[PDB]
Design a protein around this nucleic acid. Structure first.
Lengths: 150, 77, 71, 111, 386, 136
RNA sequence: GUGAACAGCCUCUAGUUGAUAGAAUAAUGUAGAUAAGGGAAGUCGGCAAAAUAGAUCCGUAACUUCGGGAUAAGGAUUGGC
RNA sequence: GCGUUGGAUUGUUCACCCACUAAUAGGGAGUGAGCUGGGUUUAGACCGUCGUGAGACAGGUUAGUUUUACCCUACUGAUGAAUGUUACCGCAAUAGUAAUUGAACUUAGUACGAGAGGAACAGUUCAUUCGGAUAAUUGGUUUUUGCGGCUGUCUGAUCAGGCAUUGCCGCGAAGCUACCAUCCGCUGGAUUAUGGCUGAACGCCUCUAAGUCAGAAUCCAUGCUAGAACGCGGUGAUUUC
RNA sequence: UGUACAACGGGGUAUUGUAAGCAGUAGAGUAGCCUUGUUGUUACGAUCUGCUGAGAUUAAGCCUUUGUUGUCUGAUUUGU
């Protein structure tokens, strides 16, 4: 058994999940769920559907070229078994998942740096633009403090 | 072909029962019995961390007198 | 057939395919190779010299730390 | 699930896929085969008048010429310019065979 | 005039009347044949059907076409916290059948059982066994008398157990009480075992174990008044037939001038008591053991609880029984698991089961992840995160 | 199972009832086959005999080479548009449902098969596996 | 307003909100839909549904009382800006 | 005991035909206003034969309303009064009953055979038909009107919405559900035909007369369903002003 | 009168497919404007991009709950 990836949204298709389509070219098309299968039958482009991983990679929503993302490849030529090699492999995978999660957090922060000052520019433009409700605000705090005395 | 109630297939089944199958049943049972003994031992080990009567006599006498007094007795008249 | 015959017959002899393959140690002859871990194909991460790539990754990552990548 | 999508996109009515068409367009030999085609009593126009991009047959040269000026042909042509969406693309997007995806893109761009 | 084309009967005449089962907890109408040479064991158990999930199994079935090949199987997860013994019942063998001779109860009974004895527990004074605990005070003379009576006269001993239903995610606080027959050992040994156990629990792995075929006895899921077309599978009549097309067309001949019992009529479907036998145990889980749902091929260190729990049933915090295939009764339902009534001679009953993987993805949708950790690592960081 | 079939066949979802046109995968010259019968089918009253991948049918060549039409020859289904289950759990389907002309002992009239062939049919029919360039 | 339209659909002026009600949501019905794979194998009978459908452009057979057949058939299109 | 088909055909049915099948056995009660087709098909019409005629027939063709149950009983399911009250746990009279067939590995290319060919029991694996469940998965379905979009119009525009007899399109959880999905369906006695043992009748003999062994998918139980609402048992609590 | 129950809320778990708002030269081109120039420029402009897997929905027969707010109450009958 292995996790395949949905031909549409790159999601994990575990054993017993989704369906598969085989063309006249022996090219199997795994799908994680009927959503992706139906979107494929309808000839929808997965690179223009924002919820697919192909779109997020092509547009740059998520990091694409990395060192951690090169370690998982389909191993054509196999290697003989070895407990030490496979235990180092399991430890390696535990390390790679951590490092790749850290790097994707870093990439997302890079993507969302600059949101702070732009949102502050929006807030300053709103407060500059609407002083009348600001006067209303001042009156409401004034009533609050006048009431808070006993 | 051969039915469920077939004597031939049932006899082949019966020859097979006494071999690997009853062996596996009895061994499985021994293992489960040992697990039960472990379980009771563990429970007692956490434990250390800390006529018939007058009711039944009157009940039966009344029931039999009601059955003899309504003529509703299976056993007597 | 002879081992098959004294262990139960044609359809009853459960052949151990494992006791005939060739390893650096017969003590891991019958050991189970894991398939799945945290959603990743172990076979696809399986690689000789995985320690080399892993250590190169570790060097690059602690360099990224000391260079200030996660400030 | 509805009526139209199940009516049009059955596996009975399934049309040629885009990467296959891209490979049909990839080489001069395949395209020159597809244009100068043997006659075929079942195909419209006896098999002549083929639109390679749309992968459907026209009944005559008039219906092909009118086809090449329509938004359906433009829609199909635009769908084919870039890099065809294969299993390479759905694999590397999860961190899997990413190297072959990358150098496939380079090979496509350079050829 | 004879029937023109011979066709078999729609339905089974041995599952009649298709009425609602008289109780939600299906009775055990037969227990395995008592063999006094073996040690004392419980012949059944009580758990709750939690739901179903998917298993990859490394199939070792010699002579098969799937021999040495992984095969994906559906399985049923039965939540089984330990049941606790509270009583004994002794049965004498009479010319009119078995007869309950006497019943001896534990000194202290929980609230969970006591709730079973009231319809209105909150209103009650909860006086359930108050005059009976005193029989233990007077050095247990009455208790010893009835136990000696069971020893002297009973030819079948059944223990009374009950489920710690508070351990389940169920909202029901009224525990489920049952008689489980004790097999193995002499009558005196049965009584002594049970007396030793009157407040101790019995774990599910002290009754069943992996690679055992067991019977599932439960009342099926109920469907209400349902018509012939689906209560019996009668063919639908042609379109727009007058009086309707989802009904049986001809009911009777000129004789016997009646509708027979055999003619399929509409009525209650489901909620019938059924005994489904030979369900291979794929895993006997342990509550304290994390990585219930992990195997030697799948190292993810996860419990069998799917993400989001089961649907219409909470987590599995307890010991569980995972049996191959589907089980009578729906989720949340008390099921009685029974030892097989015969030494099965199929080679399936002998196989060791070697799971490769348990599907702990969400049953509340098209679940694509096994752990929340995996879902997070596949999504990446969201906007809730900075 | 049938004549020339290798071993048992497990259940797969029936895709091809009688009266179903299916493509001719081999190069015997037929272009499509018309299922008139299905080998091994049970006798349920109104149930049409249905065929699936790996099943031997009786088919007439409806379109194609005139040396082959008007004749009823056995055929073996090699593809299927109805999604069926593979035990290493995946439900799969092909884009068309197709078959190959076989003599009743299993041998292929054609010398090759074009397009994919399901492994449930290649495994069951050695002469199909031996004539199929693409399996699964 | 859409649209070729006094079609269907939505609205303004004007009018009405009248038809025993409430609560559930079993079977069977009445009315209306959807359905994988196959496609008439169902049936006395393709009944019923489905499919087609507006407009533009290309094209259009036998036969014929030369007027027709003919919207024959068969194709290519259609939005927004 | 258990199965006994899919179609083609013509007033229909058998036949017969094609095929599949383990086999495609033959019948009874059949389903005359449960539903339907032709015919009894009534007043229309056309042609043929006859008749002086009105018309009727040796014909042939065509079109042509029919309406329980809301009563009793049966049957299918559902309540239920009282036998101190109330609760729980059981028993089992009776009644029902269910599994079925094929071929695959091995026994084998063995027995057997000049040769062509070619078994089976024991050991295994699937499948057909049926049945009982179930919904992990896959598929179907969608008033989750859950999300999104589209047309026309209306709310001044944006927003957010109304209406279009569920407006239409896409996806759609949950639920329901499908050999369109999955799981599960046994083992002890007594017999039939028959094969025998001992043994008379009848100084031979004899499976039968007395007695008796084995033996069919049979029967009866085991197992499974209901539980006598007027069958029964065990057990818990039994009202304080 | 409590590990009580409820109504909300929080967290998961699932469905859709990227909200409203603002910005951008990104944009078929057409007008106008002069610094008549190659991001010339001011306005319009389907759509595109950024904030934004966002926003909405999520038990009504999903799971969970260190939060908030409230409720715990009537009626009827039963004895050997």
């Amino acid at each position: 058994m292995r996790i395949y990836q949905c031909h549409f949204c790159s999601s994990p298709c575990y054993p017993g999940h989704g369906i598969m389509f085989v063309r006249n070219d022996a090219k199997e098309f795994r799908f994680c769920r009927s959503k992706c299968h139906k979107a494929f039958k309808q000839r929808r482009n997965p690179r223009k559907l924002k919820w697919t991983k192909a779109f997020r990679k092509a547009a740059g929503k998520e990091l694409a070229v990395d060192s951690t993302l090169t370690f998982a490849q389909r191993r054509n030529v196999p290697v003989r078994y070895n407990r030490e090699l496979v235990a180092t492999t399991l430890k390696a995978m535990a390390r790679i998942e951590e490092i790749r999660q850290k790097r994707e957090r870093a990439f997302y922060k890079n993507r969302m740096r600059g949101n702070k000052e732009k949102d502050f520019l929006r807030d300053k433009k709103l407060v500059e633009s609407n002083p009348e409700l600001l006067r209303i605000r001042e009156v409401e705090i004034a009533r609050k403090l006048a009431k808070e005395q006993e | 072909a051969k039915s469920l109630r077939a004597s031939s297939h049932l006899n082949a089944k019966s020859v097979k029962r006494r071999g690997v199958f009853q062996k596996a049943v009895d061994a499985r049972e021994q293992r489960i019995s040992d697990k039960l003994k472990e379980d009771l031992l563990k429970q007692k080990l956490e434990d250390l961390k800390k006529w018939r009567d007058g009711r039944h006599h009157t009940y039966k006498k009344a029931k039999l007198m009601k059955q003899s007094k309504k003529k509703t007795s299976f056993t007597r008249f | 057939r002879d081992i098959e015959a004294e262990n139960g017959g044609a359809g009853v002899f459960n052949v151990n395919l494992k006791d005939k393959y060739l390893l650096e140690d017969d003590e891991w002859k019958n050991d189970i190779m894991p398939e799945i871990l945290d959603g990743k194909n172990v076979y696809d991460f399986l690689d000789p010299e995985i320690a080399a790539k892993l250590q190169a990754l570790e060097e690059e990552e602690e360099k990224l730390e000391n260079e200030g990548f996660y400030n | 699930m509805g009526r139209y999508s199940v009516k049009r996109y059955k596996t009975k009515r399934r049309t040629r896929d885009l990467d296959l068409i891209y490979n049909d367009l990839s080489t001069k030999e395949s395209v020159q085969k597809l244009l100068n085609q043997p006659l075929d009593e079942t195909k419209p126009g006896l098999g002549q008048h083929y639109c390679i991009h749309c992968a459907k047959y026209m009944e005559t040269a008039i219906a092909l010429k009118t086809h090449l000026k329509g938004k359906v042909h433009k829609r199909r042509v635009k769908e084919l310019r870039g890099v065809p969406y294969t299993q390479e693309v759905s694999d590397a997007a999860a961190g899997y065979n990413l190297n072959k995806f990358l150098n496939r893109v380079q090979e496509i761009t350079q050829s | 005039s004879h029937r023109k084309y011979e066709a078999p009967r729609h339905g089974h005449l041995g599952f009649l009347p298709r009425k609602r089962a008289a109780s939600i907890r299906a009775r055990v109408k037969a227990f395995p044949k008592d063999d006094r040479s073996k040690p004392v064991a419980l012949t059944s158990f009580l758990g709750y059907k939690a739901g179903m999930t998917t298993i990859v199994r490394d199939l070792d079935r010699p002579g098969s076409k799937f021999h040495k090949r992984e095969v994906v199987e559906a399985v049923t997860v039965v939540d089984t916290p330990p049941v606790v013994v509270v009583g004994v019942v002794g049965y004498v063998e009479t010319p009119r059948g078995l007869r309950s001779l006497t019943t001896v109860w534990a000194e202290h009974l929980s609230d969970e059982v006591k709730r079973r004895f009231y319809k209105n527990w909150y209103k009650s004074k909860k006086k359930a066994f108050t005059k009976y605990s005193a029989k233990y005070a007077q050095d247990g003379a009455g208790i010893e008398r009835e136990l000696a009576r069971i020893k002297k006269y009973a030819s079948v001993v059944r223990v009374l157990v009950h489920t710690q239903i508070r351990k389940t995610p169920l909202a029901q606080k009224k525990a489920h009480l049952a008689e489980i027959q004790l097999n193995g050992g002499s009558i005196s040994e049965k009584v002594d075992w049970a007396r030793e156990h009157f407040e101790k629990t019995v774990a599910v792995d002290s009754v069943f174990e992996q690679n055992e075929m067991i019977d599932a006895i439960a009342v099926t899921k109920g469907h209400g008044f349902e018509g012939v077309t689906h209560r019996w599978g009668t063919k639908k009549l042609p379109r727009k037939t007058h009086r309707g097309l989802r009904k049986v067309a001809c009911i009777g001949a000129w004789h016997p001038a009646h509708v027979m019992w055999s003619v399929a009529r509409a009525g209650q479907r489901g909620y019938h008591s059924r005994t489904s036998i030979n369900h291979k145990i794929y895993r006997v889980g342990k509550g304290d053991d994390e990585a219930n749902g992990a195997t030697s091929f799948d190292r993810t260190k996860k419990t069998i609880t799917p993400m989001g729990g089961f649907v219409h049933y909470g987590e599995i915090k307890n010991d569980f029984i995972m049996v191959k295939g589907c089980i009578p009764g729906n989720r949340k339902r008390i099921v009685t698991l029974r030892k097989s009534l015969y030494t099965n001679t199929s080679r399936k009953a002998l196989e060791e089961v070697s799971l490769k993987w348990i599907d702990t993805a969400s049953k509340f949708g098209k679940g694509r992840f096994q752990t929340p950790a995996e879902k997070h690592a596949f999504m990446g960081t969201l906007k809730k995160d900075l | 199972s049938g004549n020339g079939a290798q071993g048992t066949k497990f259940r797969i979802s029936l895709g091809l009832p009688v009266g179903a046109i299916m493509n001719c995968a081999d190069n015997s010259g037929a272009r499509n086959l018309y299922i008139i019968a299905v080998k091994g089918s049970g006798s349920r009253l109104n149930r049409l005999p249905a065929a699936s991948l790996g099943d031997m049918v009786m088919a007439t060549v409806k379109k194609g080479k005139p040396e082959l039409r008007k004749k009823v020859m056995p055929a073996i289904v090699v593809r299927q548009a109805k999604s069926w289950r593979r035990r290493d759990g995946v439900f799969l389907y092909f884009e068309d449902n197709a078959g190959v002309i076989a003599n009743p002992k299993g041998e292929m009239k054609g010398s090759a098969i074009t397009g994919p062939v399901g492994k449930e049919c290649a495994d069951l029919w050695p002469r199909v596996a031996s004539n199929s360039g693409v399996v699964v």
